[PDB]
Design a protein around this ligand. Structure first.
Ligand SMILES: [Cl-]
Lengths: 372, 372, 373, 373
């Protein structure tokens, strides 16, 4: 078995999935859905990697020739994972290994690093994905609930995935490279619990803004992301579910400034209009940010897998943004709602809901981008 | 066989479906989906009715105990249609006979009048539908393309229906009374061919604004509708498809004022903003009209079965209206797009597309109105 | 104005007659469910002139244009001119299929449907040539009894029967095949559901329409022997056995024709009397012999299971014993999917979804069996 | 501190052992695909200590928590401590099922999987009592070969086989039933797909695990006769015949054990040699006798058709001949739905959707046959 470091595979012979920064060796795998794809001959292939964690252990999934093969947790330390063995030596196999767990904002210990491969065969040219999609979202885009029984409720890694996920289903159907940028419970303006700090726009611009602390800083997570190096055809923004929820949740005491925050509902039962306007402003500002870093991308706000109540607030944001900016490449697309037969665990979208949403999103993108 | 005129069946023993005016005997059936439901014992039931037409003949459909049984054309004259025969005399049968064809704005001859029933059994109490839904739309709500082969293109009655139609599927699922108000090719502001006269708001307030001419005037179609007599829980507005289309269609020379009308697109390929604003205004004005006549209804703009490109212009209208009016009972719900496997005739939604849209709309209404 | 063309004056190239026909050409008697005509015509307008008669059991028909369901209606006794299409674009051809929704009625000597001619402003064009041909033999499932109507409906009347929503015509359509339907609700391979030994399909198989009886039907030519040589199917689908199974759990039957009572017995533990099972086995062997005699080259396929699969072993016993003796390598068994609680129509019979499921599995089978990809 | 509890030290009411077991209790050998253990435990954390060995064909396991698929992975030789869950809410019980994905391997004396015990901070609670019991006997279909992997994949290796995506475990799960899987890819009721006459399921049925050979397996207790009285199924599902039919189209086999060549012959007209069919018929009769001997009360259901139905008449001939000769009223035939082009997995075998479809039909059948509504 030859050993080849990940950074010593020429670009035509590896697809790196997910946002990368300056660190090439070993390769930090920052986001859910991030990882590597290679095409190799030979009988045997191993990946050498390193992980660390405490409460939230790492999970990875494996696909060979586009088909789901394996999924498992990895506990802290050095690992040598066998990706395949005893295979016919002359046949090339396409191998994709990716992270199942989202980046963890409040967990500075959790990491996954790819070092290299042990192999008896040769690396071949990988498929080239000219089509690129970025997905920005909350627990739905982290695939929380995509595994696990209906009544399971523990907030732990085994229930989250990129392997059963509307975003990766969509990218696969369209033969597209994809980036996932997501955080469970977070909104465009505030988290479901009224936590104003927990908004996606605040972490969007760094390599991985959701990877904090000195270790992640050494990994290059807190540097500004090189947007010019990876420009998506479309940016799918699945946010708002948590912003809606906050209106019905208790006030949040912010330990960083001592102030309390609450999205208010009137004695009328209706949402406080000033508070809706905070979401609208957050949407205008985030769309501005997205456009600044992605000059040519079609921005598509795609929302509805867990209710559609923020439809009008979202489109108010898009409309006000596009008028002021003269931006003709921002759209709204409603995703299908998760029904009783289609829930996974955590009262979240199950695999069938993810599938339903992907079918509709793929149809929309085929027509919008002319990807027939 | 006893004869009972339609107006001589007590209200607890008949459900009249669709908008009615001053004329009660015989009963004019102005709209698609309009007609009657009774429940009768006996071996045999006939309905006596009158129809007239020229180019566009009448079509009706029959359902017994909720199940589709028959569909046929009716040519001009008096008819006696046998609804059932040779049945067990003691068992009650629920019988629903309704019009498959939309009102025809440009056809003053077409009509359908229900006179009475011939029956050996007795009329029983009918189901009571406290739930009420109004649907306002274009050819989709007229069910154009719901029947016929994929490649059929002739613009004739046989391809239209209430029998295979998302609106009636939705009402049936929710145990609701329904009214359909629809016209193929028409928009909220203009027809697909830029015909500014062809807008639904212009015909909304009359008993049947789309039934014009001397004969229809005698039927009471051009009198103002008594909205207080039938107040819906929700109003589903499926308009905009034809408004978007007009942007890519040649100018329209209006014979009523000699002026030409054209929804313009820039050399940019983008829609003329001033013309978009005309649609926004028409939407604001129409929502005002809807609220005036329906003070308590949840108004739900439901659009997307044939593309969703007007999503933002529609929601701009809804948002500006609701801000100025202080109206908290207006919503937007995007319907699923018709995909290649789901077209009917005329490149319009087939039965499967209607089914998919109904599934999503029913789910939406259950949550919105608390109809679990 | 519209031209009038008598049905018998349309050249064989410009009309497809669906279903078994006999000596009578003008007017054309339509004997069986799924029977009728297909033409392809230009013009704006098309009518069919026909005659029907009936008493308790009124005629039903259904109309398909360019392969799509359009209409379905009752027809009461007398002369009719039915408008099939109107106000259409004159230059474009339309394929028009009008067929009978109601089975032949064994006990009813009055019910009939006769096609006389077409009124048309356009021209008849050449019709599809169906080299593929399928015969379906069965009971109420093949009569599509329950394919229309609500779950709780029980009245044994015509409106609930169809060829328009029917696994057999679904199968024929998917495969681009001409089809013949020969069916009778409640009948078995050996006896009816009610133990009536007279109500068996093989007994009526050989005549033009053995199920059309009495003097009126005799003059229409129904009781003459059918000319099997004129229409040879690639496969014969035999959906029988459901009623034979049921008879074991039904009261004895007094036969008014011989005064004998007949009863398929169950043993005290609840299983079928073996000797009575053997009677069904014999009936199957004999029917397979009859089928092979009139159809020397057809693939015979016993297709059963839409309302339970309990007779599986008895059916295959009949097929195996028949085949071993005859050296017939063109007889097969294929199990159809059972109707589940979500897929019943009226009369607790297969609804449209069950018919669809069965047709899907049957179409797959036939493609592989016959080389019809 | 996590408690360690040896598997043999858990009271029988607090553990469900899935799959055939023999004399060896500590550690527990898991012989068959679908075999493993189920416990219900509180606590934040659970590990299983196990040992595996293998050469060419490495072990695969799958994990389900509260009836839901969670994980699947290979296991290379040695002792392992596999964490089944962690960081969970301490007071809530979790049902945990860990089972073997890989079939018994007839020609591989090294491959094994032994369960040693659990590490746990919580307590074992009483497990579900499965009164319902189903045995499945079959070939690669019952081994779930092709249930994972891409369409064009052909390598005959463990990663493509499963009990996690398998019509048998799907059926058992839907019916709240304990299950035993006894299967071997390529094997028939009479001979292997390659005419190998030694490769037949009946020859390995009677031992604890006849497919676990060699000294290592002999020590694990695999070659002792199975204690059938200790686990009596309500029904035995026999999915065999696919490889028997295939052999007719395959080259002759030189048997290295006796020096003779074996060939199921096909006639020049293209049909199967009858004498050779009769060998399958006899094999079926003998096997049903074997099944009845060790399972005097079980409903035996031959369930066949996921990869073609060409042997159905030969199978039912075997069943009918057995049934009449023995007076056995509790043997049935049920045809499973064929895998279509959209539903293939790897190896041109049934993919997950086909397994699902087959389970749907089989579950309906079993609900009706056994009264499990
Ligand atoms: Cl259609």
């Amino acid at each position: 078995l030859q050993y080849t470091e990940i950074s010593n595979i020429s670009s035509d012979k590896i697809n790196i999935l997910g946002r990368t920064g300056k660190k090439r060796q070993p390769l930090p795998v920052f986001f859910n859905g991030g990882g590597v794809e290679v095409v190799v001959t030979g009988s045997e292939l191993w990946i050498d990697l390193e992980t660390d964690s405490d409460v939230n252990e790492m999970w990875v999934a494996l696909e060979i020739n586009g088909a789901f093969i394996a999924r498992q947790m990895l506990l802290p330390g050095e690992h040598s994972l066998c990706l395949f063995r005893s295979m016919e030596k002359t046949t090339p196999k396409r191998v994709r290994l990716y992270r199942e767990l989202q980046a963890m904002n409040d967990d500075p210990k959790v990491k996954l690093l790819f070092k290299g491969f042990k192999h008896d065969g040769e690396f071949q040219n990988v498929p080239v994905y000219s089509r690129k999609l970025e997905f920005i979202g909350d627990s739905i885009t982290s695939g929380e609930g995509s595994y696990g029984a209906f009544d399971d409720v523990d907030w732990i890694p085994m229930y989250m995935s990129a392997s059963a996920n509307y975003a990766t289903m969509t990218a696969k159907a369209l033969n597209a490279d994809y980036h996932l940028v997501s955080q469970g419970g977070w909104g465009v303006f505030c988290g479901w619990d009224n936590d104003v700090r927990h908004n996606l726009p605040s972490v969007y611009e760094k390599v991985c803004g959701l990877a904090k602390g000195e270790m992640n800083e050494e990994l290059g997570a807190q540097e500004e992301y090189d947007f010019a190096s990876w420009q998506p055809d479309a940016i799918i923004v699945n946010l708002g579910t948590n912003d809606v929820t906050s209106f019905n949740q208790p006030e949040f005491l912010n330990p960083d400034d001592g102030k309390t925050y609450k999205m208010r509902t009137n004695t009328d039962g209706t949402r406080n209009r000033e508070d809706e306007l905070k979401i609208v402003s957050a949407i205008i500002d985030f769309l501005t940010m997205l456009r600044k870093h992605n000059p040519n991308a079609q921005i598509i706000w795609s929302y509805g897998m867990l209710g559609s109540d923020l439809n009008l607030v979202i489109t108010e944001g898009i409309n006000k943004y596009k008028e002021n900016a003269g931006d003709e490449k921002v759209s709204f697309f409603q995703l299908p709602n998760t029904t009783m037969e289609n829930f996974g665990s955590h009262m979240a979208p199950g695999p069938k809901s993810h599938q339903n949403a992907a079918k509709e999103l793929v149809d929309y993108l085929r027509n919008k981008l002319g990807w027939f």
